[PDB]
Amino acid sequence: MKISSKQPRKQRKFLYNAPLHVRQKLMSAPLSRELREKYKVRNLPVRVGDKVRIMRGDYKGHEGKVVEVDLKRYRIYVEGATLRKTNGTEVFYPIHPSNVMIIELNLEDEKRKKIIERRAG
Amino acid sequence: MIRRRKKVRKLRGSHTHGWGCKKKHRGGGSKGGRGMAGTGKRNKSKWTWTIKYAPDHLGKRGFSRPPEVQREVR
């Protein structure tokens, strides 16, 4: 018994169509378990200034810094999640934040800092 | 419950599909004129009708009451 869209097609339209700002809520990723308990924040929107571990895909338990987070693609580039490119260089392998877990944060900004501490937990 | 197509069939492939000769299915002519048409006709049209007592005659004769004059009783 719930208010719902039981239209999967309409649900898709909302995801693709969405504002750039609202997209930040989709790029969030779960905190490593100790930090997740401590702050009592289930997830947070990922940054390039953070450290991350890639937890699903071929890479599992692998770690790196987030180089870029791109909102329109819905994938992020992580250091060491790479492909080998056919000329002779190592390039990032785009992967979604749903596959990934954010092991450490970084706070050097007030907007990010204020949320995590207060209303979120 | 009976599938009309199930009877029509793709079946019978009668294609006439319970109508007969192919020529027959058409316009108003099979019907003999539209509707009640032909009852009145002096001429052949429907005279006799798909009424049991056939058709009763035309001229509703006799007169009307005003609705007011009719007391209802019960």
Place this chain on the structure above:
Amino acid sequence: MGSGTATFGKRNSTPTHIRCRRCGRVSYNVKKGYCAACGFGRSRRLRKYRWSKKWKKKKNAH
């Protein structure tokens, strides 16, 4: 007129129909001063009709 259509047709050369000041379609007949499509020159109003024409493009646009 009938056949010999090739032999005939040296007019059209002269133009009597354009991109309209009001609508922008191809019907502002320079000679009459009337747009066939929009009705500019003829009327203060745009040409629109029950059949229509004008409406159809607009619905189509929606």
Place this chain on the structure above:
Amino acid sequence: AGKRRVTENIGKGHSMARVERLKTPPRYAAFVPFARGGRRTHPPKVEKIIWEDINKKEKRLALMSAIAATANYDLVRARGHIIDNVPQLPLIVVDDLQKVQKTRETREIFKKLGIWDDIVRAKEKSGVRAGKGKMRGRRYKKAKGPLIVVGKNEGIVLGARNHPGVDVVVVDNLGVEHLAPGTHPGRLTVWTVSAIERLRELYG
């Protein structure tokens, strides 16, 4: 549709049919059913049937008929409920159960009664359907299980709508759909003492 596509007749004297196309392209038209783009033949109308009456006397008798089916063992095993508490068809429990409206509390009680086992059945998926029509909706969903009737604590229990396949009602709202969906009665019920009393008074 079919008034947005004008349709004009292409004549004779050229060894094709006298069936209408369009001006300039020879394509799809209107007033055709054979053509691409043509009318369908007998499109769905908004005047299409959508009600089937069934008498107030008749409906109540139907309701009675579906509740009676539960008392029977043979219907109950066919319906697919697997019961570990056989002489207790249907099961009546004390009035305190209705007031419970929390998922964790209503859960515990079922395991002790031996009727949690039925929900385990209802977890098994029976609506990831075959067919493309799934896309529009009505996919990735659970299945039915026990029906709980209460006397009081509003028109539904605020913790028992949670449980899989469990549909909640009161005796002042009970309908055939809940009692015997898809015309398969013998769906286990769990009754409340005041609900059985008020149903006693059968009315209509």
Place this chain on the structure above:
RNA sequence: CGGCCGCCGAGACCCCGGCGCACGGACCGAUUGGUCCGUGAUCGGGUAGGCGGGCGUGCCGGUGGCGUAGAAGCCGGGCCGUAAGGUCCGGUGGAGCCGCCGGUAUCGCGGAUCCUGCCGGGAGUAGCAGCGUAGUCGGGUGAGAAUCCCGACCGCCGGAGGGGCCAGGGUUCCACGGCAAUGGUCGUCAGCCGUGGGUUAGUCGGUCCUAACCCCGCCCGUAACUCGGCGCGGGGGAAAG
């Protein structure tokens, strides 16, 4: 032609086994249906048509299943079914899918000078001829030259196959780089493709005037107008006056 005898020769008729129908009997089920036995010599062609049973398709609901250790779909094979159609294997494919039961319909395709889409023969044929019938040798360039360029040589044209322009077209102009496409054939050329660039006005014409004529306001008509003719008043009308 008048007799006769032996044979040949149907799905008929006889005969074994099976199948359906009709009827009786029994049983089974929650409905429809099914089964078992008996009787039929006097039941079994079939268009219009009437009836009755099954099959399949799409989606919905309940129920109960399947799938990356390989779904649907596709192609060939195996098996079952009077049959409509079901089912299994191999290859291919790489995410969804069945059965049962109750429903429902923009529900089953051989034809409609059907509609649309794709494709073969025709053919390597006709056309690439007919009108005043045109090219050719050296040489240059280039991967590729009968048709690009230079010279020589041989012609047509001569109020036009030449010169300047109005309409109309609208970058087709001009340079450089090319040839997949386009050019009634090739193409290194081009009007194609790619990329850049170019139209400069006191004294040309437009613009001004006014014609045949037009419109507008006003007056008036009309049920009324985006309609209608007069009379006033103004304004517009020749890129060959």
Place this chain on the structure above:
RNA sequence: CAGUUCGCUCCCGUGACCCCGGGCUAGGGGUGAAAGGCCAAUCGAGGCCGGAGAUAGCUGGUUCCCGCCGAAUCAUCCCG
């Protein structure tokens, strides 16, 4: 070559001639040296759109299977 063309031959060729540009007249209306000709590959009443999925006793087509029964092509009436 061409949805009305070509060559020879032929008529007219200072005219009731031809031609350009402007401008006027619109569908039971115009226009016609008047043929029912012409009014934009459409004329014994143009084209476009709508009515309109007109209606036709008339042509064509009408799609799964199986089982059972199995025709009449006559009569009376009818602008039939």
Place this chain on the structure above:
RNA sequence: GGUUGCACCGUCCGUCUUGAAACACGGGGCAGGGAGUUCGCGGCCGUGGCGAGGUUAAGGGGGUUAAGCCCCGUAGCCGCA
């Protein structure tokens, strides 16, 4: 099972038609699309509830996420001479 030889029999299909192998009409081939439908009203049929009565419609209370079902309204219709 494929293919082919051999024996025997067989003049398409669909439609028009009294008669079609036709010198009647239609079709190159293939794929897809393609035709007994909806409302009202009447006459039938099967099946089901109720019962000399029977059924609600319109509606608003109520319930629900919504909604159906539930219970409530009985106007009117038909039946009861």
Place this chain on the structure above:
RNA sequence: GGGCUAGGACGCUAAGCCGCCCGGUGGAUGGCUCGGCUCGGGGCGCCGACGAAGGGCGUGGCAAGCUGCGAUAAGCCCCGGCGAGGCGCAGGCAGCCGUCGAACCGGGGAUUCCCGAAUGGGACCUCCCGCGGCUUAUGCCGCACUCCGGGGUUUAUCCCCGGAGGGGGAACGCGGGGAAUUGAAACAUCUUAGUACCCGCAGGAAAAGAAAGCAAAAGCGAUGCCGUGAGUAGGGGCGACCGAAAACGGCAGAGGGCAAACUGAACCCCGGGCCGACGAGGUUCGGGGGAUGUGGGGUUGUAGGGCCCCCGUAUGAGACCCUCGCGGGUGAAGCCGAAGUCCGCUGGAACGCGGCGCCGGAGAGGGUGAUAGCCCCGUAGGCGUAAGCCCGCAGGGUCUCGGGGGACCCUGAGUACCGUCGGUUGGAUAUCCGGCGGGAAGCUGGGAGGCAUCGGCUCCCAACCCUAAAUACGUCCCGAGACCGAUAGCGAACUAGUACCGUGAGGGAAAGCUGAAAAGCACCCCGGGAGGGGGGUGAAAAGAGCCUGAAACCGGGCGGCG
């Protein structure tokens, strides 16, 4: 086996037939769906000379389209909101911006070309021009079509200040004009039908609307709308067809203003000031409108309307409007929100299987490398604010009534009604509306109850005006599906109202799918070669309209025939 003669031999049988297999062609099929369609709930519910809708042309680093904007040109500024990457669709290269907080979202503001109702005049989307202001000039600012309202003056009706109009709009609505094919198997009355189509016009709802009603004669006291009455009465070649209402049950509910009698400038508009929270209100001062009558009274029914009296007697008490502090809820579409990413195994990747474990006033639905209640958006629950909206709390201001006594108030005109012709309707003698001719009454009166007239009986006041709400729609948002799914469904899943056609009116397509990641093809061999082949991807029947990849059909090969 050799030689010789003869018979029959399959051995390399073109052309060609069939069956399968491989490749090609082609784009069917399935699965996929950022699209439709219909329903429901709300919203939208108008805009414009303060220049709209529609159209044209520019505008980006590179810009061909779409989308957005407008010379300040995919934008400028403020505030609030989310807040850590962005730079539209559009994954490139390059460079840029942003905590003095972007992109984005809301509200407000700046700029907003030209044409267009287009208003100074004409035009083929351009051009010209008469005033006046101002800077020395260029530059730049304001103006002159046609009503009404008021002035100016040679009162040339010539010019000035004020307010307006036009046109658009998805359907709906209201008022006008008005067919035919068809049906009646012909067809003229009838029917289609007051339909199609056409004109005028308004709003967010319209219209209707407080009885000159109804008429089961009984009983009712506005009007829409729905069900029903009823396919009834009734009309009609009395043929085909045509066709109500009253009433009932419901829904939603609301009543008020003039003319006149009697008063007669007591009045309205404009500007300025005072008093007052600069507001409401009241006061005063200069013009204009106004007796051809502003304003007061009053309105189905008359209350005596005038003038009287008697008693409560402006005694008494609301009811209505404005301001301003405070508090409350709604409202910038934003916030917060439970619980596994544990083991073993398969795989390219687990969202799988198996095993363990967990939350719920909360197992909806996408997404993610596959099929996820516990990975991420989210959910039951509660909450936020500027403008804006609604309410009460402190004041100020405005403001109501009831009887009988004489002619009772006079009480609506080309109306009512009659007569003549239509239109229309079901409307019959008994519809409604027009036209033509005639034509009342002073409530001491008139109309109505389905022919006329006369009597009784019962009801009710036309000819003046307005009216919330309940009822229409689908432009827009959301939610919904016994709907469709790319030769289908919207014209159109996209470069669509495009390409294109047509002088024009108008007509009008097709065109969806890589993969885990673009790694979108380097390096090496070959090739004139932008062509093409081998090697290079988890997998290239994943290699560039790239998922699958049918049939017709085309090559080759295999079997068989020849």
